[model samples]
Target: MSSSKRIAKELSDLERDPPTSSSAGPVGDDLYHWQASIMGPADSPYAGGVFFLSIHFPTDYPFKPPKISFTTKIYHPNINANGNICLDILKDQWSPALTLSKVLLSISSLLTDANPDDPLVPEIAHIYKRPKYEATAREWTKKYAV
Candidate 1:
């Protein structure tokens, strides 16, 4: 099967078994490019919000991890202002056994629980380090998520 065909199948499977508070589908005219919407986790700083993300898969996928970035501006340690993500799984640490569905679910969970100590953004990480994160995170969520 062609890469795009497999992508279509995987996407369809995800649609049939959508992740909690999240949905994903192809972007206009491009199967390699897709979008995801996630409902913020309950009780977390991101609660009650909707977040959008973009995913771009390399043509040589399965052998290479797909790229994902936040299309919505969210305050988090692992995501930068430009929407770059610092997740290990998307990098060299990725395993072929990890499915796209699993990766999306992982990102959805990452939104709720940030790795502040090991952050991509220094400022956001600092706020969490100071233990003054809930309010800051909530503020960012409102400004961006809303």
Candidate 2:
């Protein structure tokens, strides 16, 4: 199928059965550009916050990965100070079979389980493994993400 057709189908699926912790759609009239939000995972410091995201699909999408970023500030080891995400699927692990829904699910999972070893922000990653990690993360979530 053409990229447009594939994207349309994905959009339909997104609207029909959204991800467990997130929701997304085109940003106004552009199918290639979408906005998304993920409710912070339960039992985590970010639990009460809602993080927003921006997803930009390439014209060659499904074949080439889309660019995903956090618009809301989050203090995550895998997410940088500027909202850049360090998710593998958004990079080399991308597969045509992976839809926006899957990507959102992965992001939501990241909130609950952070990969401190391979982090976007090494400093944040360092703190992420410390004793007061959840407390610090929660403070940041309320300060910035809420």
Candidate 3:
């Protein structure tokens, strides 16, 4: 199947079995561009925050991972001020079989379980194991994600 076909199929299955923590769809007629919202995990400091993200599929998608970034400024080790995400799945680990649903799940987990070893923001990564990181992240979640 082609890119649009695969995206169309994803939309259908998405409605049938929506990801538990997020919602996504095309911004308008442009099927290649999508906007998504992720509900902060209840167990995480970001609870009650709603984070928005942008997803842009390349012309040859599935074969090439979509570009996913956080639009809702978040203070985390894996996400930078520019919203660029730091995830292996979005990079070298990308697989043609991965779907939007799975990708969103991975991103959501990124908020709760940050990868300090591959920190996008060194300041946050430095305190990833400290309680202050949670405090700062929670503060930012409330401040920016409101």
Candidate 4:
């Protein structure tokens, strides 16, 4: 099957069994492009925020991984202001069994437990490691990303 066809199938499957915190759909008229909204984790800094994200599947997928970016601004160690996310599986540790729903769940979890030790953005990483990280993230989310 073609890459787009396979991606469509996977997307269909994910929609049928979406993660509890997320919902995804095609980005109008673009099969290879998708959008998702993630409900913040229950006890996290982003508990009540609605975060927007974009998913772009590569022309050669399964062998390669999808590229996910945040359309909504968020304060985190692994995610940059430009929406580049630094997740392990999305980088050099991807597996064929990983699905779109799985990745979306990972993103939702990441909002609360970002790995500051391995940051994509240095400034955010520094803030993430602080004892007051929650307060900082909440302030930023309310001031900018809200």
Candidate 5:
């Protein structure tokens, strides 16, 4: 009951003040499984691309961080092929005080400011030499994200 209540509040908050370049809500009638989409930050190589991500809230959401995965393929050192993200807030750093909108904004900013030092995709991390990485990321955005 508490989880649902909080989820409802979060959803309403997002509707009232939806973050820039992103939007999310329940997928169909399933309140626990939400689908979120974010527009690529203008300054990043991912610019012009729209990325879709799936969010799964556990039965005890807020107490447990929701699982998020990219439905749209993206090439980033911090995001693996499986769409797993390495953002600490979604893991050990999560707190009930956090909201989906804030989290989505964080992810949105990550596109432009990646954490290449602790990369999920080592191959991409190793290739994170500015120009090269941007070119490859831009290429992937062109092919995968439209």
Candidate 6:
């Protein structure tokens, strides 16, 4: 099927029954370009924050994964200062079976459980194991994402 049709279907599904803690769809009239938001997971430092994201689907989507990046600044091990996210699925692990719902859920999970071993910001990853990491994350969440 065409990528356009697939994107349309995905958008319709999100509108019909959105995922918990996340919402996504086209930003404007262009189905290939989308905007999304994920509410921070409860009990995490990022809790009560709303992180926005940008998604650009390739012309040959499903075969080639979409490019997703955080539009909102966040302090995370897997996310860098430039809003780049280091998620496996966004790179080599993506599968056709994965949808926007799964991506958003995965990002939300990343907030609660960071994979510090594989990090975009090594400095943040180093601090992630310390108490100060959570404090800083919470501070940034309140300062930027509130």
lDDT for residue 60 in candidate 6, whole number 0-100: 87
Task: Give the C-alpha lDDT of model 1.
Answer: 0.80
Q: Write the per-residue lDDT of candidate 6 for residues 31-96, one digit (tens) a residue.
A: 788899789877877889887888988888777878888889888878876677878888888899
Residue-level lDDT tens digits of model 2 in 66-92: 888778877767877667887888888
| TM-score of every prediction relative to native | 0.89, 0.91, 0.93, 0.87, 0.94, 0.93
List model 1 lDDT by residue over 16-79, tens digit each.
8877668777899878888888787787767888888888888876778998878898777788
Which model scores highest in lDDT? 5
Clashing pairs in 1: none
- Model 1 ranges off by over 4 Å: none
Better of 3 and 4 by lDDT: 3
Ranking by TM-score, best first? Answer: 5, 3, 6, 2, 1, 4
Candidate 4 residue-wise lDDT, 21-111, digit = tens = 6777888887888888887776877777777888888878777899898888877768787889878879877987788878888887777
Candidate 3 lDDT over 1-146, as tens digits, reads 57789999998888888777688877898888899988878888778888878888898877888988778888777788778987998888888888889989888787777798998778777775557856767678777888
lDDT at residue 77 of model 3 (Cα atoms): 76
lDDT of each: 0.80, 0.80, 0.82, 0.78, 0.85, 0.82
Report the Cα lDDT for residue 32, model 5: 94
TM-score of model number 1: 0.89
For candidate 3, the lDDT comes to 0.82
Better of 1 and 6 by TM-score: 6
- lDDT for 144 in candidate 1 is 75
